[PDB]
Amino acid sequence: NRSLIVTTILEEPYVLFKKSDKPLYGNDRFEGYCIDLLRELSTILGFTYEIRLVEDGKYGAQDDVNGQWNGMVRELIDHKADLAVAPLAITYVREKVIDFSKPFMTLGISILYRKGTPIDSADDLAKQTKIEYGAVEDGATMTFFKKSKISTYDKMWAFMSSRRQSVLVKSNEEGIQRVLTSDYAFLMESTTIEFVTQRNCNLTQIGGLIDSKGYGVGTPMGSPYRDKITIAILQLQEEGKLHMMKEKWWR
């Protein structure tokens, strides 16, 4: 049985380079929530695999003009990878081109901002133009605002869109630093906000969840592995493994 090619991307605490003095080889060079998840999926389902980092460094978005997909989503579409195991959001637009297992983690979009201000919700940001705000460019969060029919979010999209190169960033880290060094609020996924605020007492989540979504394993559309991965994830859930992995990497 040839080994599966599993595409992923660096993102703390899901995927990180394992540190050591002694040389690390193959899949052992990686660690994190998604790495532990993947290992369990392989032993539960009985497959071997090789971890690779998505070449273009993206999750998956469709080009507005040429309509082509990029990121891990595109690698799956083109059968360049068998599975994608990362904090990949399960979204309607993505489900149209690839398949997803049931979620291994639930979350929602929220706001990351500095403490000490009266800003208390998305509405507060939307009704003003002084404090700038944004999201990772073309990520699931930004796309949510772009496709939203809700006036408040539509207004926010118009804002970010008009100042695209100034307010949209390339990573969660860039967004975090931007919040820390300027009057800026960052729209990001709650599970990452959770990790960040526990490590920086100057940061806080603002308001509650803007939506409800989850992360799932991606497979090429029609892959016989999608349903099998779901079975493995459900077993991990009932065995309390998913909860243990969350506590392990978030602590």
Tokens of 200: 């920086």
21 CB-near residues (< 8 Å, 6+ apart):
none
Distance CA 193, CA 187 (A): 9
Q: Does 31 contact ligand KAI by CB under 6 A?
A: no
Please give the residue ranges that form the binding site for a copy of itself (CB under 8 A).
Answer: 102-103, 106-108, 115-118, 120, 204, 207-210, 212-214, 234-235, 237-240, 243
Residue 129 assigned ligand-binding role: no
C-beta closer to a copy of itself: residue 5 or 44: 44
* C-beta of 4 vs 168, nearer to ligand KAI: 168
Of 34, 41, 88, 126, which one interacts with ligand KAI (CB under 6 A)?
Answer: 88
x/- site string to ligand KAI, residues 181 to 220, per CB under 6 A? -------xx-------------------------------
140 labelled binding-site residue = yes
Quick count: other Cβ atoms within 10 Å of Cβ 127? 11
Any known ligand binding at 158?
Answer: no
C-alpha dihedral, 42 to 47 to 52 to 55, nearest 10°: -110
Assess contact for 189 and 208: CB atoms under 8 A. no
Position 85, amino acid: V
Q: Which two structure tokens, joined as six digits, stand for 130?
A: 């002084």
**Which of 119/167 has CB closer to a copy of itself?**
119
**Smallest gap from residue 109 Cβ to ligand KAI (A):** 7
Classify the C-alpha dihedral 146-149-153-157 as positive or negative. Answer: positive
CB of 201 to ligand KAI, least distance (A): 22
